[PDB]
């Protein structure tokens, strides 16, 4: 009964005007998933080039500094085709097309 459908980020984008604030272009072949974990203020994207890039939720504004990924990881291989942030825990999960599933502890506790 206590659990809620509301995801990490409640809806404050009540009405998107269509304005753009960043044009992050680093992947090469095809992005096919996006996750957001506001508990750590991060969000992630995988693709078919074998990389799972982690960005920062506070650096997206790019109002002062440039916008670039905080981390990368391309050792699973194959074609990373899904991922999910682990709620209440400081790690991520990914599943390659090799048929491999692995965790990836994110060092967000230390800054």
């Amino acid at each position: 009964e206590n659990a809620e459908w509301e995801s990490k980020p409640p809806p404050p984008g009540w009405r998107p005007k269509g304005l753009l604030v960043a044009h992050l272009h680093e992947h090469k072949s095809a992005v096919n998933r996006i996750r957001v974990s506001d508990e750590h203020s991060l969000f992630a994207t995988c693709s078919n080039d074998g990389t799972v890039k982690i960005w920062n939720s506070q650096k997206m504004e790019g109002k002062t500094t440039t916008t670039r990924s905080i981390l990368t990881y391309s050792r699973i291989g194959g074609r990373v085709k899904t991922l999910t942030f682990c709620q209440g825990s400081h790690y991520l999960a990914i599943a390659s097309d090799n048929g491999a599933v692995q965790l990836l502890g994110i060092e967000a506790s230390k800054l």
């Binding site: 960043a22 680093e26 992947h27 096919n32 996006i34």
Partner: protein
Amino acid sequence: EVVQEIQNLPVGHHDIITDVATFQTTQGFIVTASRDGIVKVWK
């Protein structure tokens, strides 16, 4: 209830979009990604 839709430098994506998320820190943003690797954080 069938809600039909009928018709009477572009910043939009130029290829198939594959996801739409929404993260918020102070004012909610929308995140997207096309099949060519681009990512765009709307407001």
